[PDB]
Structure 1
């Protein structure tokens, strides 16, 4: 009767993976996809009632990615491979946009979790958690949407786990801190799957039983309204609580509201 839903958000930003491939490093996007598929198969093998969802983010949008081995796992892997191949082959750079649309993927994941919750029988509770792997740099332009997503996830009690590969993201740290999730930075990319099989694999009840690394130093720098950049000290309005980097005779937001 214990229903566990795992949603894996994969940062498939073409620029970062292209740079990694040009670096000729030991880790590639193919290995990351294989590790994600193995983690999903392990999660499904943990319990029959467990459900899996995979969403891949891109500059364009978010795509729902979902012979000796399990038949259902074979079909799931084939579907994931077909979806990722379709997304990558049809991915055409049309515009100057480069930041990953991480907020949209999280919103779609929350919508999918909400949809699945209603279909769940009343006698069972569907415990849901979201795992995010970060490859490219964080986007500061989507601060408000990211915070809204964090608050929505906290309202429904949905864990958010962050697995940073190269560049640490403050937004992911804040999400993990607020939602109670786990934030972890990968020291060695080729060993990534092992971490996925050691830290994020157990459920929240199982995490209490086991011993986990302490949370990293979470930052709480805000984003200025007129700059959309991280700041430490700024001017905050006393009415709409808007944050400004520099003093202004009149609040722009308050002037907007009539």
Structure 2
């Protein structure tokens, strides 16, 4: 508990979730995981970001805050559901944007913490989507920044093939798991990382 820990969760919003058939359930599970994480230690913090087809957006920004976190997440995702970028209208997601947002937040939190002692942070991606060539430069830029920062990027691929994310974990020294049985999502989040 001595070390402050920030875990940023990037959730891939892509309509691939339709293939999943449920997003609502995925949120419920992610919420349980977050609550546990916050409960483990006082010093743990969480940030949640959505990587959508069109852009990346911040869902939320402590455990006392959890009630707030739950409401903010449910509401934020619902807004996201919009028709544009529907189904595999757009196969990819804006992970590069999400990672950029995550590193900015981690940096800001770190500076404040710098006044104090060191902070440990790691980024978790729940990835539904596929990578694209156009995406390569942007994504890698963020990935390399994280590696230099020594911030591990873990990835849980529910489905699809995001090679870049796989590369991102190896690179970053993070963990990559392609989940067989997506309904076991909760176990993977708790157990896998």
| TM-score (norm. length: structure 1) | 0.68
1:133 CA drift (Å): 1.0
Structure 1 range deviating more: 9-18 or 90-99 = 90-99
Question: Residues 106-145 of structure 1 correspond to what in structure 2 (within 5 A)?
Answer: 106-145=99-138
Give the 3 Å change call, closer, same or farther, for CA 45–174 of structure 1 in structure 2: same
Superposed CA deviations along residues 197-218 of structure 1, whole A, max 9, x for unmatched, are 1122xxxxxxxxxxxxxxxxxx
Distance in 1 between residues matched to 2:103 and 2:89, nearest whole Å: 28
> Would the aligned equivalents of 2:122 and 2:153 in 1 still touch at CA under 8 Å?
yes
When you count helix as a share of all residues, which structure comes out higher? Answer: 2
Max Rg structure: 1
Gaps of 5+ in 1: 21-27, 201-258
Q: Can you give the 5+ residue segments of structure 2 that lack an aligned partner in the other structure?
A: none
TM-score (norm 2): 0.89
Instruction: For residue 70 of structure 1, report the CA deviation from its aligned partner.
Output: 7.7
Quote the Cα distance in structure 2 between the aligned partners of 1:47 and 1:94: 39
Tell me the distance in 1 between the aligned counterparts of 2:167 and 2:41. 30
Alpha-carbon distance, 1:136 to partner = 2.1
Question: Which SS does the other structure have where 2:115 is aligned?
Answer: coil
> How far does the alpha carbon of each residue in 1:16-73 deviate from its partner, in whole angstroms, 9 at most, with x for none?
42574xxxxxxx111111111111111111111111000011122112111xx98632
C-alpha distance in structure 2 between counterparts of 1:122 and 1:71, whole Å: 23
Q: Which has the higher contact order (CA 8 A, sep 6+)?
A: 2
Shift of 1:97: 4.8
Q: CA deviation at 1:95?
A: 12
**Count of aligned positions:** 191
Question: How far apart, in 2, do the equivalents of 1:144 and 1:119 lie?
Answer: 30
The CA deviation at 1:104 is 0.7
Contact 1:160–1:176 under 8 Å retained in 2: yes
Out of 148, 160, 182, the residue aligned to residue 155 of structure 1 is 148
Aligned 8 A contact 2:125 2:153 in 1:
yes
Alpha-carbon distance in structure 1 between the residues aligned to 2:156 and 2:67:
26
